[PDB]
Design an enzyme around this catalytic site. Structure first.
Site, mmCIF file in Angstrom:
data_model
loop_
_atom_site.group_PDB
_atom_site.id
_atom_site.type_symbol
_atom_site.label_atom_id
_atom_site.label_comp_id
_atom_site.label_asym_id
_atom_site.label_seq_id
_atom_site.Cartn_x
_atom_site.Cartn_y
_atom_site.Cartn_z
ATOM 1 N N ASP A 109 1.488 -1.174 0.023
ATOM 2 C CA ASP A 109 -0.107 0.065 -0.125
ATOM 3 C C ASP A 109 1.000 1.267 0.312
ATOM 4 O O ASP A 109 1.791 1.412 0.515
ATOM 5 C CB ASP A 109 -0.968 -0.030 1.123
ATOM 6 C CG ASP A 109 -1.974 1.176 0.978
ATOM 7 O OD1 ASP A 109 -2.281 1.729 0.812
ATOM 8 O OD2 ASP A 109 -1.879 2.148 2.390
ATOM 9 N N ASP A 167 1.333 5.015 0.668
ATOM 10 C CA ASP A 167 0.490 6.563 1.468
ATOM 11 C C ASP A 167 1.140 7.367 0.994
ATOM 12 O O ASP A 167 1.749 7.865 1.878
ATOM 13 C CB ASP A 167 0.061 5.940 2.340
ATOM 14 C CG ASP A 167 -0.818 6.934 3.472
ATOM 15 O OD1 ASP A 167 -1.106 8.011 2.285
ATOM 16 O OD2 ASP A 167 -0.940 6.960 4.196
ATOM 17 N N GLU A 172 2.019 11.184 1.039
ATOM 18 C CA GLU A 172 0.847 12.410 0.822
ATOM 19 C C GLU A 172 1.554 13.907 0.966
ATOM 20 O O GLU A 172 1.991 13.688 1.811
ATOM 21 C CB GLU A 172 0.506 12.098 2.782
ATOM 22 C CG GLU A 172 -0.411 11.276 3.210
ATOM 23 C CD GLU A 172 -0.691 11.067 4.769
ATOM 24 O OE1 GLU A 172 -0.896 12.055 4.737
ATOM 25 O OE2 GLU A 172 -1.898 9.681 4.285
ATOM 26 N N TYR A 192 -11.491 11.715 4.937
ATOM 27 C CA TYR A 192 -11.354 11.894 6.513
ATOM 28 C C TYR A 192 -10.891 13.177 6.596
ATOM 29 O O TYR A 192 -10.285 13.472 6.499
ATOM 30 C CB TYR A 192 -11.645 10.915 7.699
ATOM 31 C CG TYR A 192 -10.266 10.284 6.846
ATOM 32 C CD1 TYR A 192 -9.484 10.488 6.941
ATOM 33 C CD2 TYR A 192 -10.227 8.420 6.843
ATOM 34 C CE1 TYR A 192 -7.724 9.728 6.776
ATOM 35 C CE2 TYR A 192 -9.928 8.153 6.509
ATOM 36 C CZ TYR A 192 -8.535 8.088 6.723
ATOM 37 O OH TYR A 192 -7.131 7.268 6.566
#
Length: 594
Positions: free
Chosen positions: A288, A290, A292, A369
């Site tokens: 995965d 991620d 950011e 979120y």
């Protein structure tokens, strides 16, 4: 006749295909991968004909043969598959073979094939569910949750997950490459320790101790090769072999190195080190990513390029090609996933690249979120809501806006996994609000958090802040709960079973891929329960003793005896900082004189 029955000698019975050094602090010195374990066995036959041949058998199948030269023998041989075997020695001659009683050996390997299933009872409010939804039900487990949060792998309600994501696997690099880590005390230094002598832009393990060395349930012993989170995850894999366990590279403070991967030299190094990682740690089922975020506006204000969209597309293609090659070598299926921003500026420009890269990816984890929080004291709102609230129907940042923007760009909906939050974000001193809607006011600061400012575990919200001085209100337009303490202006925005159900039903209508959450340790069970239900799954005398008072903050060795809450307790293994009763590491052994 056949020779007499030999007797295996007492000796070591634990071996490892992949070795782990327990004192090591650097990743390069932490793990050694071998093709097989070197197994050894000795034996005796003190009276009788010792035969002319000796054989070692594992579960009846012959592993080694040699001359029987006397009443004593040793054999050294290679075992290339992990497991627990029944080893016997046989002495033979022309009249037959006579086998020993079985001695059991353990040959370790990073798939967990030597471990009994970690099949743990559900804790707190978690309920059992049958995975017939066909959708993704995923959650993140944080490497560092095993400390203050006291949340180890044996506490994961693994039967109610389809995906378990491991945050976070870091990318090696010092100054300029992981500057964001410096904002967390000791975190940048910890990564340098781990990457000593290791090329920049290769993956590593951020906390080797938590990941491999810290004793945990079912992996407690000095000569258990894999302890900590990796060992337990391997046991968990034995208990739930359809569970997909993915390592998650990146996150808020470990994303900086992605920004350099426009350089293919760096990117190839990274992609290769990932292939090596999955080869070293066979219990992982893919990767995965991620990052950011591509384009910037993550932790680091000096990083971000419009080249990043292209770089993102390339990284996903190259990773897919790597996993495809790796599947060829191993026969296994691997998943490639990414977590992408649900809403910031220019996310529509980024979503076009997601549309190009989506065929490289099994699932897209939409981070619906953190839409609002203590990082903005002036614009309050629902941090993880489905829709906009009545009082501001034009709110940009909502789950539905993220999903529609992705779809608008042609992302297939089945890839889209909607995010739920097992934490709240919150403010203090909310004031100047109209209509008793606290979100229309402003704040003076962050709500006091569970572990860090402005962020509250859902478990603490439910446990402490839904009543009394607190008012618990559900916004049925936004599909978003909040609690509010008017005496202090404390306002917390979060997910609950109702808003989670709204998301899950939405997922079912819009044919999206499922739900995922951050972070598994902070749930009391209501969130994961609602995640499953809403996506379609349905339900399924002690001796008087004396001991010093437990001292919070003390790290206890194995065998410590503390008095706590009227009982005398005992640590079953080492490195224990938890209060007695809060985990399976303490054993009640005594009563305190009343």
């Amino acid at each position: 006749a056949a020779p007499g029955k030999p007797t295996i000698a007492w000796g070591n019975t634990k071996f490892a295909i992949v070795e782990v050094d327990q004192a090591a602090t650097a990743y390069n010195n932490l793990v050694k991968v071998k093709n097989a374990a070197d197994v050894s066995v000795s034996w005796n036959l003190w009276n009788g004909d010792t035969g002319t041949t000796a054989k070692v058998l594992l579960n009846g199948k012959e592993a080694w043969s040699g001359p029987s030269t006397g009443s004593s023998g040793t054999a050294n041989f290679k075992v290339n598959k992990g497991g627990r075997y029944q080893m016997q020695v046989a002495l033979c001659n022309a009249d037959g073979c006579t086998a020993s009683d079985a001695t059991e050996i353990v040959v370790a390997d990073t798939d967990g094939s030597h471990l009994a299933p970690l099949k743990e009872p559900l804790l707190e409010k978690n309920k059992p569910y049958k995975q017939n939804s066909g959708k993704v039900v995923g959650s993140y487990f944080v490497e560092w949750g095993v400390y203050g949060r006291n949340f180890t792998v044996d506490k994961i309600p693994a039967q109610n997950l389809t995906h378990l994501l491991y945050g976070f696997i870091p990318i090696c690099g010092g100054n300029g490459i992981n500057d964001s880590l410096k904002e967390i005390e000791g975190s940048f230094q910890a990564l340098q320790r781990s990457c000593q002598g290791r090329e920049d832009f290769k993956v590593s393990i951020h906390d080797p101790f938590a990941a491999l060395q810290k004793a945990q349930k079912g992996v407690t012993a000095w000569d258990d090769p894999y302890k900590g989170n990796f060992g337990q995850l391997m046991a968990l894999k034995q208990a739930h072999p359809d569970l997909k366990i993915l390592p998650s590279i990146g996150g808020w403070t470990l994303s900086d190195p992605f920004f350099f991967m426009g350089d293919k030299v760096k990117r190839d190094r990274f992609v290769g080190s990932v292939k090596e990682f999955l080869q070293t740690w066979k219990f992982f089922d893919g990767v995965d990513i991620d990052w950011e975020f591509p384009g910037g506006k993550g932790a680091n204000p000096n990083l971000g390029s419009p080249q990043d969209g292209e770089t993102y597309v390339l990284l996903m293609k190259e990773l897919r090609a790597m996993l495809d090659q790796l599947s060829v070598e191993t026969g296994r299926k691997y998943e490639l996933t990414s977590a992408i921003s649900a809403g910031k500026d220019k996310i529509d420009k980024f979503y076009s690249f997601v549309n190009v890269a989506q065929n490289s990816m099994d699932h897209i984890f939409l981070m619906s979120y953190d839409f609002y929080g203590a990082f903005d004291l002036k614009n309050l709102g629902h941090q993880t809501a489905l829709n906009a609230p009545a009082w501001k129907p034009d709110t940009a940042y909502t789950t539905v806006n993220g999903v529609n923007a992705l779809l608008a760009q042609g992302v297939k909906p089945g890839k889209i996994v909607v995010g739920t939050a097992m934490y709240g974000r919150g403010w203090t001193g909310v004031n100047g609000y109209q209509n008793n809607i606290p979100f229309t006011g402003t704040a003076t600061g962050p709500v006091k958090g569970t572990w860090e400012n402005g962020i509250v575990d859902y478990r603490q919200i439910a446990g402490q802040f839904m009543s009394g001085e607190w008012q618990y209100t559900y916004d049925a337009t936004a599909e978003a709960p909040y609690v509010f303490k008017p005496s202090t202006g404390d306002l917390i925005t979060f997910d609950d079973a109702r808003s989670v159900q709204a998301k899950g039903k939405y997922v079912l209508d819009k044919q999206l891929g499922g739900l995922f959450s951050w972070e598994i340790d902070a749930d009391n069970g209501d969130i994961l329960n609602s995640m499953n239900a809403s996506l379609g799954a349905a339900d399924y005398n002690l001796p008087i003793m004396t001991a010093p008072a437990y001292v919070p903050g003390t790290t206890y060795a194995q065998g410590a005896l503390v008095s706590y809450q009227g009982y005398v307790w005992q640590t079953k293994w080492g490195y224990i900082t938890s209060a007695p009763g809060s985990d399976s590491a303490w054993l009640k052994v005594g009563r305190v004189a009343h």
